[PDB]
Amino acid sequence: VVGGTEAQRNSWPSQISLQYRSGSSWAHTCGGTLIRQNWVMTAAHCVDRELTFRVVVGEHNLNQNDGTEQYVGVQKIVVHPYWNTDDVAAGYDIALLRLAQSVTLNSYVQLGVLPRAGTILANNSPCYITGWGLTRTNGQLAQTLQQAYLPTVDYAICSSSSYWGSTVKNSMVCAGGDGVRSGCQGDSGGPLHCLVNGQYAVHGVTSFVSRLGCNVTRKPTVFTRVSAYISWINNVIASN
């Protein structure tokens, strides 16, 4: 997260760190959202490869003991069948991970509320992105969970040629684009929390940014639109 600040510990209890086993230890690669006691929602491009994954819930500091963490294996990876590794702009960048064990919920670990199927936010709706990603283009990971205010850019604006053009699809949510705040490497798979009728819900799964950099004006961060996959999600859950 570029342009952000360190989140407080109870603001985003649904955020998790996705990590792969690397030799002796593990390595943060992506974000994700806890949506059931034993299911996490992330981006397909994060789990495209055959590696050993775990999610950390109640994580705040990647390399210090917060006293609140549960380190949970991923047993099952379910990618959207139409995901195409080589065409992220086609969409379907979503995946669900069934955890080896169920986590225990507390003030630091909660399920993320998803929107009703088909929900489309009005333009410039207030949202926050969160994660441990780079704090500047080509920088280093944030050790502590970061948040940035990142309001939505509606499809009509985001798909105009000055923005993302035909690269954006209606199955996505764009946010930010002001050249100061955005998602960045290590944030993908994580949530976009958007404030509607007083309560937060995870409207996006961080997917992509410009090749020119993270906080590029008129290149807002692009998220898979969760509300377009609600029936797919529920049926993955119900069938496994």
Binding site: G183, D187, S188, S207
Partner: peptide
């Protein structure tokens, strides 16, 4: 897909 934000 880099390293992952996916780069678009």
């Amino acid at each position: 897909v880099x390293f992952a934000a996916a780069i678009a």
